[PDB]
Structure 1
């Protein structure tokens, strides 16, 4: 029933993602000195510290908005990878599976609570 519960649930999931070794390439914005052509390929950079900062600033209204930005971290990795076998892309796929497995109940509980609120 709690329409605000998603926020702490997302904070806890972000904490788990930061402890996961697979999140290392995605914890901070991609370094342009490391990947000089990054902005020629990626229009909208995204990373987990930016997601956490947006959440802590009170700049997400719903967990769907947070989801959209986390999914953008993974689609940017898929678009930038030179190979479906690359180390960083392979890390992104495992981390995406872990994220999707955990965000499912957050989204469901939020949408259910909002439907109850507007009944």
Structure 2
């Protein structure tokens, strides 16, 4: 019933993601010199370094807010890809399955801790 435990759990999950080869296209902001039309398609850029910085600055109040920004990385890849068979989109799909399998328990434990506090 530890209400603060999600923060270290999210830091450790981001460490695993940065070790995965599939995260390489998503670690830093998409390079606008390599992809000059990117901001004609994508309104709100997001990347894992920005998520980690926001966490470490104390600017997430809940793991749900972190989960919204990581899901934006994946939805931006799906909206920008020219093919649902592309290399970089195929990487985003595998990474999203890994993220979703690991974030599940973080969110369940946090919500359980809040309910116990409110009891």
On whether the aligned pair clears a TM of 0.5, the verdict is yes
Gaps of 5+ in 1: none
Q: CA RMSD in A?
A: 0.3
Q: Runs ≥4 in structure 1, deviation > 3 angstroms?
A: none
Q: How many residues align?
A: 119
2:22 partner SS: helix
Using the TM superposition, give the Cα deviation of residue 35 of structure 1 relative to its aligned residue in structure 2, in angstroms.
0.6
1:74 shift after superposition: 0.1
What TM-score, normalized by structure 1, do the two folds share? Answer: 0.99
Instruction: Map Cα deviations across residues 71-115 of structure 1 (whole Å, 9 max, x no partner).
Output: 000000000000000000000000000000000000000001011
TM-score by length of 2: 0.99
Task: Give the secondary structure class of the aligned counterpart of 1:36.
Answer: coil
What displacement does 1:28 show? Answer: 0.3
Name the CA distance, whole Å, in 2 between partners of 1:31 and 1:84: 21
